[PDB]
Amino acid sequence: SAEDKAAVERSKMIDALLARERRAVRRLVKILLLGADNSGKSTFLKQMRIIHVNKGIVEHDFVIKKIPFKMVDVSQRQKWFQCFDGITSILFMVDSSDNRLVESMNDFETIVNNKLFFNVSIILFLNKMDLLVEKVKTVSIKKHFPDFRGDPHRLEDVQRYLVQCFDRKRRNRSKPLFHHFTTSIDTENARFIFHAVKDTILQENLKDIML
Amino acid sequence: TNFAVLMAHVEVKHSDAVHDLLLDVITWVGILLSLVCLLICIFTFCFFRGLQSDRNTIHKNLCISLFVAELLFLIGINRTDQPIACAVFAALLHFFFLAAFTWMFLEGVQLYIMLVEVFESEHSRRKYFYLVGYGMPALIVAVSAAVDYRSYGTDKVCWLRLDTYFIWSFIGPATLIIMLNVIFLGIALYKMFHHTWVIGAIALLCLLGLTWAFGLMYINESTVIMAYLFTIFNSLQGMFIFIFHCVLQKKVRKEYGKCLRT
Amino acid sequence: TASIAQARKLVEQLKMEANIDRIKVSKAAADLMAYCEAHAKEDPLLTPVPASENPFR
Amino acid sequence: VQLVESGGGLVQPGGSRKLSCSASGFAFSSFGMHWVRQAPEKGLEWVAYISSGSGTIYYADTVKGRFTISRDDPKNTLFLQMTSLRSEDTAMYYCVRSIYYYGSSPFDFWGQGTTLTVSDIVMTQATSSVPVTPGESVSISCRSSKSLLHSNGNTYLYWFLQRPGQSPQLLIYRMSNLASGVPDRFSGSGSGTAFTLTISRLEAEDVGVYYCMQHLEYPLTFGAGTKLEL
Amino acid sequence: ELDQLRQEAEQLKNQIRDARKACADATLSQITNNIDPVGRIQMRTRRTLRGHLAKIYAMHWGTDSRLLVSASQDGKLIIWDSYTTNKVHAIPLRSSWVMTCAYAPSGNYVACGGLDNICSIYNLKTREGNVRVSRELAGHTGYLSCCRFLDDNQIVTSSGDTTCALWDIETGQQTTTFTGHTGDVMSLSLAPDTRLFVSGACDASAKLWDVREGMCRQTFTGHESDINAICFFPNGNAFATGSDDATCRLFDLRADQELMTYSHDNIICGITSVSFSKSGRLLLAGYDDFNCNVWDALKADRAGVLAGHDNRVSCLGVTDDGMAVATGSWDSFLKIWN
């Protein structure tokens, strides 16, 4: 003794430091960002920075309203995906005025039905509305898939079909699928992405109170 | 005497009946079926590290306070023969029952915190919880003893008096806490219906003491049925918790079937 | 071009791996149990140690 | 690394002083600090101890309640406050650094100290003068009055060196080990309560006085020291 | 010419298969069956080490069998004393995505790596009194999987772009690059004499390399999916591997073939780690069914289960004297068994 007794102090101080970091670790909101549309990703990130102000992995950090947000934006991806089990939501961006839609749908199906993502919500962005509106003004018809009603119709009968096509392929659902049509009003995007996570955390808190 | 005497503001006559024997048996058996579930619940929420949180703190404190208060009621009510033995128990009982009620209020505050302000807070709040919970009864008892130190004792069973209105140092806080719990439960149900069963709406009724409000309408001879509802439910409180918040919870059962049983 | 170089590298690697001198399995097994029985009085997890000297007991 | 002290001077009976120490070149917040004293012509003697985190504070028996120790972290400065001083407080004071985790080597660095002037286990030093000539292998002994071994396998004791005109320097810590910046020709060993330091291939700049400390539990106690000649 | 080279490659493969077949005369099931069964083994937690804020990814015993390094997902690297449950050091990192750790034989340096494709080397003994980073080695393209010192001035890295490399710390350059795989690389182990090393590489193929020369010497096949752990028997002429098809096997080099196949019919979760004992008599393993199994390496039978974790087991290790065993899992606790 008498020198195996300052070591106890040292240990206690380190314990205190970690015990004060726990809470801030638990308050954070981690969002993963995926898609094949780079222009939409760049535009959305620029808009998010504008709202906040008022290679490898490229982490971006924000504070929406008194809450900390982290966005990651990183062929054997299944090994890479082991490190992302503590996230809250996956944000999938897709071009609408396109074809490669079947490619996007296949990638969506591959991403969703994964064992590690059993407790994560999914947000879906369908972007480039202006081009779709212009190219349905001089409308170009669909493919051979069963667009049952109003093949060369206005956007009100094409948007519903597209969102219904993406809504399915969720074999293990357990949660809702939020969807959105991107607008050039930044506050709309910020508000929607802030509302989704709030609803997720209420959905988790009602399991301990037995809905 | 029976359990209902705690919350009656007017003496009753009971012209002619055999209700006293039934009430005595019911109260004795019910308040003995607690005090074992309470102990098993205290040990339930203390020696397991997989359950530590603010909710666990509030549960544990409530169970402790009920255990002590019911023990003292069971032992030291019929002691009016010694004018010194009680008139001290008529303050300690005050303290512990009012502590139980403050903890039941903190439960509804927690419901709000988890259902409206959905996100967490950067700094903990254990200090304020303990301060309010164990300091409101202390201040109330101190001020009440300072104001009128003579009424702490009656002629039949040594509890608070009635000739002066001093019994209203317990009923008032109970009524106010019950009303606020009603408000919080309404908010919880609203956000449980709009943003999207019976077992949850029954499990919330045990903690928030909303069944204690019956005994206030026990006024005259023709209302004795309500006096039954008070004794059957309230005295059985400690049982209900042990069923709703020990057995019917996945976390507790999993944490206890793997170490205590093997 | 590149395919020819890759095929030549693969062929050379396989040829170099083919010339390695080998030995049968009975000798290797005998070596394995020789090692196992050689150091069998100093492994505490396999053979328990008196608690009078254990640092973790 | 640098510890620089200030505060010495001449004082009358009564009075008071406030000695200060400024540290530069290392991480101050992770170290414990000692104030150590030295008589004009006698051995050293320990004064006070303040640890990391400003928790444990230890004093000495002969000035307890008159002296005070304190530290300030953001400015990296130690203080000792002394009051009501008699004529036996004349000495020279030094500041010492230490750190205690597994494998650590306390008492590594020492300062230059200040002069102040005014108008328990026992170790013993065998001798005070031993004449030798270069190339001679020498050995120096100290004695104590209790086992310094412990049930965890340690053995707490220290040899320090002091050349003619400088501040001390750690030679051997915990009775068996060696420090940094020192040659490899030093060694030392002994049995319970009786021990000896061995110096081999003796050369110049080894003249001075050697000291033997113990650190089994507070207080800390000194001896007389052996003075060598050449 | 390319088709002719392919035909030559097929002939060479037939040569290799025939040569391998000509090796086996005695199967180990007909020799190890007559040894004394070990029986029942079971041990209990002595010290429990808590403090990590998230999942645990790696650990490594010291050279004196008493100190311990650990790496977690929160971005912390903690140095423990396994005797008194004391915390000696806490080091924060620059990247939060960490996947490996190492402890230098002399006790002066530690190493770390992750998803940033950089290997960082830290100095534990400094005059100023704090742990500071000494080198930041870079040049890979994908993430790192494992790093293992040899001396205080040479390090080895493996990365899942099918690459391995030998770095000279002080200079800072690649002295040698090892190539020849097709898929990623997951685990590697060094030899007791420190002249060769083995690595398994996520395509049911494993390779033995020599460092002084620089060529790829030996290859082994046998599995049906990727490989997750690899380790050396304590004499430098064997190794053991476990896959993500929930199967383990043992390889020897001179025999150039597999001998045992530790399997069971009720296990359908893959392996995450392996490690041996002193005499080469107990083979420990970590699974995804929340357990740590204890096999007898010579019989493919069962010897024990170290149950007690509330999630998946990530890492396990043995001291350099055989006394203790340590495990770490996804529940943020790390346990010592003896």
Q: Quickly list DSSP for E189-250.
A: EE-TTSSEEEEE-SSSEEEEEETTT--EEEEEE--SS-EEEEEE-TTSS-EEEEETTS-EEE
Question: Is D56 in the same domain as D148?
Answer: no
Phi-psi sector, A137: left (phi>0), alpha (psi -120 to 50), beta: alpha
Rg of chain D, C-alpha, whole Å: 18
CB E274 within 8 A of CB E229: yes
Q: In angstroms, rounded to a whole number, what is the distance separating the alpha carbons of residues D122 and D214?
A: 9
The full length of chain B comes to 262
Which chain D residues are closer than 8 Å to E130 by Cβ? Answer: 27, 30
First and final CA of chain D: distance in angstroms?
A: 32
Q: Which residues of D touch E (CB under 8 A)?
A: 1, 25-27, 30-31, 99, 101-102
Question: How close E283 comes to chain A (CA, Å)?
Answer: 26
- The answer to whether B and A touch (≥3 CB pairs < 8 Å) is yes
CB E62 within 8 A of CB E318: no
Looking at the DSSP bridge assignments, the partners of residue D46 are: D36
- Sheet with E163-168: strands ordered across: E144-151, E154-159, E163-168, E173-179
Tokens describing residue D113: 């100290």
Q: Which residue type is seen at D53?
A: G
Q: In terms of residue numbers, what domain contains A14?
A: 1-211
The full length of chain A comes to 211
Chain centre distance of CA E124? 24
Method: cryo-EM
Q: Does D132 touch chain A (CB under 8 A)?
A: no
Q: Which residue of C has its CA nearest to E219?
A: C17
Tokens describing residue E245: 């098809």
Beta strands in E73-226 (DSSP E): 76-81, 86-92, 98-103, 109-114, 118-123, 132-138, 144-151, 154-159, 163-168, 173-179, 187-190, 196-200, 205-210, 216-221
- Using CB atoms, which residue from D55, D56, D215 is nearest to A3? D215
Q: Are strands E118-123 and E154-159 parallel, antiparallel or unpaired?
A: unpaired
Which chain E residues are closer than 8 Å to C52 by Cβ? Answer: none
CB D128 within 8 A of CB A31: no
Counted domains in chain A: 1
Residue reference for tokens 């509106």 = A133
Question: Is D110 in the same domain as D24?
Answer: yes
Contact D156 A10 (CB under 8 A): no
Question: Is D87 in the same domain as D179?
Answer: no
CB E85 within 8 A of CB A26: no
Which chain B residues are closer than 8 Å to A201 by Cβ? Answer: 118-119
Question: Which sign does the torsion angle of CA B241, B247, B253, B256 carry?
Answer: positive
- Using CB atoms, which residue from C13, C26, C55 is nearest to E216? C13
Q: In angstroms, rounded to a whole number, what is the distance separating the alpha carbons of residues A116 and A82?
A: 8
Q: In angstroms, rounded to a whole number, what is the distance separating the alpha carbons of residues B106 and D78?
A: 48
Q: In angstroms, rounded to a whole number, what is the distance separating the alpha carbons of residues E243 and E249?
A: 9
Environment class of residue C46 by beta-carbon count within 10 Å: exposed (0-12), middle (13-18) or buried (19+)?
buried
Q: Which residues contact E265 (CB under 8 A, 6 or more apart)?
A: none
Question: How close A24 comes to chain B (CA, Å)?
Answer: 7
Longest alpha-carbon distance in chain A: 88
- Using CB atoms, which residue from E252, E254, E338 is nearest to C57? E338
Tokens describing residue E39: 């029986």
- Sheet with D32-38: strands ordered across: D9-11, D114-118, D91-98, D32-38, D44-50, D57-59
Cβ neighbours around E55 below 10 Å, total: 20
Contact B203 A210 (CB under 8 A): yes
Counted domains in chain D: 2
Distances (CA, A) of D39 to B254, D44, E162, E194: 69, 7, 70, 57
CB D127 within 8 A of CB D142: no
Chain centre distance of CA E225? 18
Residues 22-41 of A with CB under 8 A from B: 23-24, 26-27
Q: In angstroms, rounded to a whole number, what is the distance separating the alpha carbons of residues E60 and E93?
A: 18
Query: Shortest CA distance to E92 belongs to which of E102, E103, E78?
Result: E78
Counted domains in chain C: 1
Question: How close A25 comes to chain D (CA, Å)?
Answer: 25
Q: What is the 3-state secondary structure (H, E, C) of chain A?
A: CCCCCHHHHHHHHHHHHHHHHHHHHHCCEEEEEEECCHHHHHHHHHHHHHHHHCCCCCCEEEECCCCEEEECCCCCHHHHHHHCCCCCEEEEEEECCCCCHHHHHHHHHHHHCCHHHCCCEEEEEEECHHHHHHHHHCCCCCCCCCCCCCCCCCHHHCHHHHHHHHHCCCCCCCCCEEEEECCCCHHHHHHHHHHHHHHHHHHHHCCCCCC
For E257-289, give the DSSP string: EEEEEE--SS--S-EEEEEE-SSS-EEEEEESS
Q: Which CATH architecture has domain E1-337?
A: 7 Propeller (2.130)
Query: Shortest CA distance to E142 belongs to which of E116, E164, E181, E113?
Result: E116
The full length of chain E comes to 338
Chain centre distance of CA E175? 23
Q: What is the 3-state secondary structure (H, E, C) of A75-133?
A: CCHHHHHHHCCCCCEEEEEEECCCCCHHHHHHHHHHHHCCHHHCCCEEEEEEECHHHHH
Q: Which residue of D has its CA nearest to A10?
A: D101
For chains D and E, count residue pairs whose Cβ atoms are closer than 8 Å. 20
Q: In angstroms, rounded to a whole number, what is the distance separating the alpha carbons of residues D227 and D207?
A: 8
Counted domains in chain B: 1
E117-121 LR contacts (CB < 8 Å, sep 24+): E117/A56, E117/E141, E117/E142, E117/E143, E117/E144, E117/E159, E119/E144, E119/E147, E119/E155, E119/E157, E119/E167, E120/E93, E120/E94, E121/E155, E121/E169
- Using CB atoms, which residue from D1, D25, D102 is nearest to E88? D102
**CATH number of the domain enclosing D26:** 2.60.40.10
Q: In angstroms, rounded to a whole number, what is the distance separating the alpha carbons of residues A197 and A93?
A: 17
Q: In terms of residue numbers, what domain contains C39?
A: 1-57
CB D214 within 8 A of CB D193: no
Question: How close B107 comes to chain A (CA, Å)?
Answer: 12
- Using CB atoms, which residue from A17, A21, A57 is nearest to E116? A57
Q: In angstroms, rounded to a whole number, what is the distance separating the alpha carbons of residues E154 and E77?
A: 22
Q: In angstroms, rounded to a whole number, what is the distance separating the alpha carbons of residues D155 and D190?
A: 11
Question: How close C29 comes to chain E (CA, Å)?
Answer: 7
Subunits with 3+ C-beta pairs closer than 8 A to C: E
Q: In terms of residue numbers, what domain contains D94?
A: 3-118
Distances (CA, A) of A137 to A133, A154, E2, E61: 6, 8, 56, 70
D185-194 LR contacts (CB < 8 Å, sep 24+): D188/D159, D190/D141, D190/D142, D192/D147, D192/D148, D192/D149, D193/D143, D193/D144, D193/D145, D193/D146, D193/D147, D193/D148, D194/D141, D194/D143, D194/D144
Distances (CA, A) of B161 to B23, B85, B214: 22, 17, 21
Question: Is D133 in the same domain as D200?
Answer: yes
Q: At what angle do helices B89-115 and B171-194 cross, to 10 degrees?
A: 20
Cβ neighbours around E189 below 10 Å, total: 20
Residue reference for tokens 């001291």 = E319
Question: How close B235 comes to chain A (CA, Å)?
Answer: 24
